[PDB]
Amino acid sequence: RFHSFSFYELKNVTNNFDERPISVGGNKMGEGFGVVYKGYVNNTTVAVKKLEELKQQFDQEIKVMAKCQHENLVELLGFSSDGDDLCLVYVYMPNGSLLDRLSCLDGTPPLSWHMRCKIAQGAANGINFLHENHHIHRDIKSANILLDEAFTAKISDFGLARASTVMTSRIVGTTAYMAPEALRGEITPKSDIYSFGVVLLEIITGLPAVDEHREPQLLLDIKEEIEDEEKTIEDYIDKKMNDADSTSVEAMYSVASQCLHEKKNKRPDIKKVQQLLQEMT
Numbered sequence: 288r289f290h291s292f293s294f295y296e297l298k299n300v301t302n303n304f305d306e307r308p309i310s311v312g313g314n315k316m317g318e319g320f321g322v323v324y325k326g327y328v329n330n331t332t333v334a335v336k337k338l339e340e341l342k343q344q345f346d347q348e349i350k351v352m353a354k355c356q357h358e359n360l361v362e363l364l365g366f367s368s369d370g371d372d373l374c375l376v377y378v379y380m381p382n383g384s385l386l387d388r389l390s391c392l393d394g395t396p397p398l399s400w401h402m403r404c405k406i407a408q409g410a411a412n413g414i415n416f417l418h419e420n421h422h423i424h425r426d427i428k429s430a431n432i433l434l435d436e437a438f439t440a441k442i443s444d445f446g447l448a449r450a451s452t453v454m455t456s457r458i459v460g461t462t463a464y465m466a467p468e469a470l471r472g473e474i475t476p477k478s479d480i481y482s483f484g485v486v487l488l489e490i491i492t493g494l495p496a497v498d499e500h501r502e503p504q505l506l507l508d509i510k511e512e513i514e515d516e517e518k519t520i521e522d523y524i525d526k527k528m529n530d531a532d533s534t535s536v537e538a539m540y541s542v543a544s545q546c547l548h549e550k551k552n553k554r555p556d557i558k559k560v561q562q563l564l565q566e567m568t
């Protein structure tokens with residue numbers, strides 16, 4: 288299903304894996320462990336990720352991507368087996384990550400509430416496809432929600448994904464986004480819902496999940512500040528938008544709040560998350 292790319296072709300298309308940043312006219316876009324490069328395969332802009340348990344994540348990415356094709360999931364175009372390093376070739380996402388756009392990285396305009404709602408719905412549609420096809424992402428975060436030309440949400444990074452409550456040694460994921468049970472080693476699609484709840488807070492507030500120079504350092508702690516009636520979600524709403532109405536903001540917050548139940552069985556399933564997000568608009 289995928290194009291097997293030659294290592295010489297990938298070296299050629301990335302200007303010999305030019306490590307200089309894009310900003311400076313280089314090909315390095317980021318750093319997923321390995322470096323992500325901008326490439327041109329004929330007239331097509333691509334993203335080339337040049338990478339023991341790394342070969343496991345490489346195989347898992349191809350395996351999951353072969354089985355999963357959806358409007359709200361990134362597309363793997365091919366890979367490279369021959370040559371010095373393992374490479375993964377993806378479709379270029381012109382608007383990068385939701386994290387980058389929420390942070391207005393490189394002077395991009397803030398996302399409107401209207402775009403944020405479409406992104407929240409799209410990401411939820413992508414998680415629903417994964418859960419319907421018995422996959423647990425395990426690393427749902429704003430950096431893993433990529434954005435195309437129409438700002439369509441595309442879930443990325445399937446290297447840590449697991450088939451679907453089992454427990455494991457070797458706990459993986461991003462702490463600021465992880466459910467309590469996932470931090471304990473449990474493998475459940477219910478952990479993906481918790482991480483999506485944190486993403487919804489990042490969407491409402493424009494705040495990153497973790498900031499060492501902030502009080503509270505962790506975004507999920509704002510839920511407790513709001514719950515303990517110290518503050519309201521209105522005091523946290525991203526100020527970089529002109530179209531956020533109180534009713535739809537509270538509706539998104541109620542969905543995030545439900546996602547963020549510390550008790551995995553009290554959290555809604557992705558299908559309930561989709562329904563509540565569609566009712567919101």
Ligand SMILES: CNC(=O)c1cnc(Nc2ccc3ncsc3c2)cc1N[C@H](CO)Cc1ccccc1
Nearest residue numbers: 317318319323334361377378379380381383384443
């Ligand atoms: C302005 N546009 C971009 O910067 C951009 C364009 N296409 C991308 N494609 C793509 C699609 C699936 C995928 N799966 C794994 S890496 C990967 C890449 C990613 C992009 N940004 C991303 C986020 O900043 C770079 C990136 C940096 C560090 C780690 C991983 C990715």
